Amino acid sequence: CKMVDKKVSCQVLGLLQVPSVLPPDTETLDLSGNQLRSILASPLGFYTALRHLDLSTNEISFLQPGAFQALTHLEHLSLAHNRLAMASAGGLGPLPRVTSLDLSGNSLYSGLLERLLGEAPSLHTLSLAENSLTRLTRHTFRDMPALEQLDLHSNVLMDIEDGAFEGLPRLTHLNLSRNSLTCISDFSLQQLRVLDLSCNSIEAFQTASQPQAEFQLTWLDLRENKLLHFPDLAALPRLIYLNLSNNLIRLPRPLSQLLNLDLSYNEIELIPDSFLEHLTSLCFLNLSRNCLRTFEARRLGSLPCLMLLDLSHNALETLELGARALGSLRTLLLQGNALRDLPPYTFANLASLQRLNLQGNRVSPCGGPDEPGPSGCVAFSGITSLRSLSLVDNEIELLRAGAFLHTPLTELDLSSNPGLEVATGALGGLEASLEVLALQGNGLMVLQVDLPCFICLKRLNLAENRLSHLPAWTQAVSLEVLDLRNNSFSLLPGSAMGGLETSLRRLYLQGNPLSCCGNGWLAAQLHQGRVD
Amino acid sequence: LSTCTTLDFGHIKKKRVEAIRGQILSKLRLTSPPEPTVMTHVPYQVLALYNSESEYYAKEIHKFDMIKVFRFNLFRAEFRVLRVPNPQRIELFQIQRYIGWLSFDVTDTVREWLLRRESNLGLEISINPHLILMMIPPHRTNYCFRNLEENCCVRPLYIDFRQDLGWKWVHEPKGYYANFCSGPCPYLRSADTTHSTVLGLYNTLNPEASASPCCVPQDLEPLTILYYVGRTPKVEQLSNMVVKSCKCS
Amino acid sequence: TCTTLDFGHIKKKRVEAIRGQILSKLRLTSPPEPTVMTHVPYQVLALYNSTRELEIHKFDTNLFLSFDVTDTVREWLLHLILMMIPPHALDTNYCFRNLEENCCVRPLYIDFRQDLGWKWVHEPKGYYANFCSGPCPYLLYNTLNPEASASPCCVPQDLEPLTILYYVGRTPKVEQLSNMVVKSCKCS
The missing domain is CATH 2.10.90.10 (Cystine-knot cytokines)
Known part of the structure; x- marks a missing residue:
């Protein structure tokens, strides 16, 4: 047994009884992991200076009725993962100075607690997780008015009679996740602040009416349940977080302070007009994996504060966003929908947009301000704030010239658009700012864009395009990664690939038909420190 | 709440x-x-x-092998259910009650054998055999x-x-x-x-x-x-x- | 849906x-x-x-305590009571x-x-x-x-x-x- 300063450590294994050869001035004492089977008052009472006592993971099953009342200076006591459920006799008595008590993993049951645990004036935290409780009666928690936190997850609770929390006037955290509750009929805990009811079977949720003072609740979690309607939360004016993901909700000031609302994986199909009007302060909103077909924000000044909107994997077909609306939006995710034809100036009215993801739709970009394209194309010509764009798998046949003329974006992605042909000057304007470019899987014969002018380009991806010849670098460009796998490169002259050695870091060729003749530069690179 | x-x-x-x-x-x-x-x-x-x-709880299984033909100190276990053996019209009787790989599985006719036995007791056939018993231990x-x-x-x-x-x-x-x-x-x-x-x-x-x-x-x-x-x-x-x-x- | x-x-x-x-x-x-x-x-x-191995009609084509009399009566058709359908899985x-x-x-x-x-x-x-x-x-x-x-x-x-x-x-x-x-x- 190690000792340092009024503290004793007893190791993982090797004991069957409480030791007695310890100094009598100890103040901490650890015994987890051993093979203890009971706690008798005699050896333990010698240590009247204890303040912390850990007895978890043993096999303790019997506690002498007076064992813990000799210790008058405790503050913490842990008895987790023992076998207390086999204990008529035994139990804990008064515990005046205790402030924490852990009883999780013991397999207790309803009715045993009122005899197991006695008085506790100074308790602040109590943990009863991972037991076999089923019902909370008016008699359960008694004589503990300083309790503040109560952890009851991973039980089997089905009932909560009225008054079970009346003896707790200072509680502020309640945790009832992973239980078996089915219907909630009332809510009257004025002073509570955090409530966690996730992973249950709750079908309906309703709160009280006409309180003396407003409820203080500010954090509510009801994800992964069976709710069928958006709950009525008119009496909770302080709420800041709310999470209703993975339910069955269908849609048909209360929420003037909500800042986070998650509403994914439900069965919503149409959004009433007045619903979005109340949410004045919202900053994040997810509506992914629902069944919407349109989204409207026509009214000017609606959603003033929103910074993220998520609509992926719905079935949208049009977007009626009006100008001077969504003026703060920065991220807009729309992948997996069926958008085809849009008004030309849809995305150019968003004043702060910075990241757009359009993968999997069938959008065809415009052709620059000068000589635009046909009707129904979308204009990416002048979105001054945009910084990232994704157009994977949109079946783009033709990429017109000047498509991104006045958008100083720093990342593009055009992969998996077979039969793509890039008109000359299509990528004009991006030389000064573009950093990443991907064209994998397109299959184009020859690349018309003049790469060596791209000063800032760092990563480039050209895999699975069936190229055979590549333009020539003749300076110290900033490129650092280059991918050419599964192309048709046979010979790599050192003339065209000079100047890249100043900055190149890694590189790939596997899958190409390299020729044994020549290729001295490639051999030199393989000799050098460049990866592969 | x-x-x-x-x-x-x-x-x-x-x-x-x-x-x-x-x-x-x-x-x-x-x-x-x-x-x-x-x-x-x-x-x-x-x-x-x-x-x-008693349809929910699991069953122990005990096999009691053989010592128009006749088939016949088996009170060790005192369980319930009847045969399922290894191998016209042909049917089976007792020493003459009508009873029916093969199968004749009613939960009786060995309950009587447990209750009272005679010098000879066994099954008849008329115009690797064994038995299989199944019962739930008391604690279930x-x-x-x-x-x-x-x-x-x-x-x-x-x-x-x-x-x-x-x-x-x-x-x-x-x-x-x-x-x-x-x-x-x-x-x-x-x-x-x-x-x-x-x-x-x-x-x-x-x-x-x-x-x-x-x-x-x-x-x-x-x-x-x-x-x-x-x-x-x-x-x-x-x-x-x-x-x-x-x-x- | x-x-x-x-x-x-x-x-x-x-x-x-x-x-x-x-x-x-x-x-x-x-x-x-x-x-x-x-x-x-x-x-x-x-x-x-x-183990691992193991309308309603009554009597006492012409129409249009218990036994399995179905065969003989159906053969004859083409105290007993009969049921006849009128002429009008997910495994x-x-x-x-x-x-x-x-x-x-x-x-x-x-x-x-x-x-x-x-x-x-x-x-x-x-x-x-x-x-x-x-x-x-x-x-x-x-x-x-x-x-x-x-x-x-x-x-x-x-x-x-x-x-x-x-x-x-x-x-x-x-x-x-x-x-x-x-x-x-x-x-x-």
């Missing part, structure tokens, strides 16, 4: 009625009810026509009994044709009770160690280990009705019409 | 329900202690492999060989050591415990009975048992657990 004690079930009753409508039409394979005929009297022939828990408003019980149980309801369904063409009977099933079945979350009084809740709240249990009927009964077309009456019986119990499945 | 609910959570909940089902059919508060008894005597395996084969998105059987395999973490089961090493899933079309209709508390649920029809050989202390135990493998489904 109370739990939930009372729930209204008018919507379930009205949806049940609406479904009974279409169900009876389909059982009678019409796309619309026939318009009522004139009030007619029943003949005498129709009048004469009118006058006229028709159908609900509390007013507005919150469990899965059967609820009462009365169906009468002229009022609810507007069916003038139904003559017998005036109505009947079409009870329904309601109440939730909670999903119980498992653990490796759990108290022995909670191990009895699986048998009734989720016996099938489904991911979402449902409250579904268990016993159902048929309904006989009478109706006229033209001059000829028609006596038709429909099946699966009245509930007698429920179940969580 | 809008039926967006992810398919990995259904698998996770079916497996976690299987755990409690197996533990409570045997009535075990804690899983037994594994032993390295790799040499199981051959006789025990014989028991395991042998493994159909679901596994054809694509369906209503109520239907889905496949699942349970390995005791990889899914549940149990090292005390000698035989078998795992089994196929399917499951039922999918929505039901609201009002099949020839056989349906609308009696549940909502739209009909997707519940199993046929179920088959399972044989396990586990080991308690120093003795072997050959069990049989009922209703373990799904084979068909129905809408209520």
Whole structure:
């Protein structure tokens, strides 16, 4: 047994009884992991200076009725993962100075607690997780008015009679996740602040009416349940977080302070007009994996504060966003929908947009301000704030010239658009700012864009395009990664690939038909420190 | 933060009625009810026509091998169930009660052997054998009994044709009770160690280990009705019409 | 029809329900202690492999306490009472060989050591415990009975048992657990 300063450590294994050869001035004492089977008052009472006592993971099953009342200076006591459920006799008595008590993993049951645990004036935290409780009666928690936190997850609770929390006037955290509750009929805990009811079977949720003072609740979690309607939360004016993901909700000031609302994986199909009007302060909103077909924000000044909107994997077909609306939006995710034809100036009215993801739709970009394209194309010509764009798998046949003329974006992605042909000057304007470019899987014969002018380009991806010849670098460009796998490169002259050695870091060729003749530069690179 | 004690079930009753409508039409394979005929009297022939828990728990298995032919101190175990052996018309008797790889599995005729034995006792055949025993070790408003019980149980309801369904063409009977099933079945979350009084809740709240249990009927009964077309009456019986119990499945 | 609910959570909940089902059919508060008894005597395996093997009309074409009189009366037709129809599944084969998105059987395999973490089961090493899933079309209709508390649920029809050989202390135990493998489904 190690000792340092009024503290004793007893190791993982090797004991069957409480030791007695310890100094009598100890103040901490650890015994987890051993093979203890009971706690008798005699050896333990010698240590009247204890303040912390850990007895978890043993096999303790019997506690002498007076064992813990000799210790008058405790503050913490842990008895987790023992076998207390086999204990008529035994139990804990008064515990005046205790402030924490852990009883999780013991397999207790309803009715045993009122005899197991006695008085506790100074308790602040109590943990009863991972037991076999089923019902909370008016008699359960008694004589503990300083309790503040109560952890009851991973039980089997089905009932909560009225008054079970009346003896707790200072509680502020309640945790009832992973239980078996089915219907909630009332809510009257004025002073509570955090409530966690996730992973249950709750079908309906309703709160009280006409309180003396407003409820203080500010954090509510009801994800992964069976709710069928958006709950009525008119009496909770302080709420800041709310999470209703993975339910069955269908849609048909209360929420003037909500800042986070998650509403994914439900069965919503149409959004009433007045619903979005109340949410004045919202900053994040997810509506992914629902069944919407349109989204409207026509009214000017609606959603003033929103910074993220998520609509992926719905079935949208049009977007009626009006100008001077969504003026703060920065991220807009729309992948997996069926958008085809849009008004030309849809995305150019968003004043702060910075990241757009359009993968999997069938959008065809415009052709620059000068000589635009046909009707129904979308204009990416002048979105001054945009910084990232994704157009994977949109079946783009033709990429017109000047498509991104006045958008100083720093990342593009055009992969998996077979039969793509890039008109000359299509990528004009991006030389000064573009950093990443991907064209994998397109299959184009020859690349018309003049790469060596791209000063800032760092990563480039050209895999699975069936190229055979590549333009020539003749300076110290900033490129650092280059991918050419599964192309048709046979010979790599050192003339065209000079100047890249100043900055190149890694590189790939596997899958190409390299020729044994020549290729001295490639051999030199393989000799050098460049990866592969 | 109370739990939930009372729930209204008018919507379930009205949806049940609406479904009974279409169900009876389909059982009678019409796309619309026939318009009522004139009030007619029943003949005498129709009048004469009118006058006229141990499955849940696991079993130990004990095999007792052999020591128109005859088959015959086996009171070691004192278990229940009968044979399933390794190998015209041909059938089997006892020393002469009729009993029937093969199988003759009733949970008896070795209960009697356990109870009383004689000099010879065995099975007959007439115009690697063994036995297999199975028994559970010892340690292992028709159908609900509390007013507005919150469990899965059967609820009462009365169906009468002229009022609810507007069916003038139904003559017998005036109505009947079409009870329904309601109440939730909670999903119980498992653990490796759990108290022995909670191990009895699986048998009734989720016996099938489904991911979402449902409250579904268990016993159902048929309904006989009478109706006229033209001059000829028609006596038709429909099946699966009245509930007698429920179940969580 | 809008039926967006992810398919990995259904698998996770079916497996976690299987755990409690197996533990409570045997009535075990804690899983037994594994032993390295790799040499199981051959006789025990014989028991395991042998268990694993197993209008209305009345009287007293012409028409248009109980016995099975159906054959003779049907032959004659072309005290007794007769019923005559007036002149006017979702099993493994159909679901596994054809694509369906209503109520239907889905496949699942349970390995005791990889899914549940149990090292005390000698035989078998795992089994196929399917499951039922999918929505039901609201009002099949020839056989349906609308009696549940909502739209009909997707519940199993046929179920088959399972044989396990586990080991308690120093003795072997050959069990049989009922209703373990799904084979068909129905809408209520």
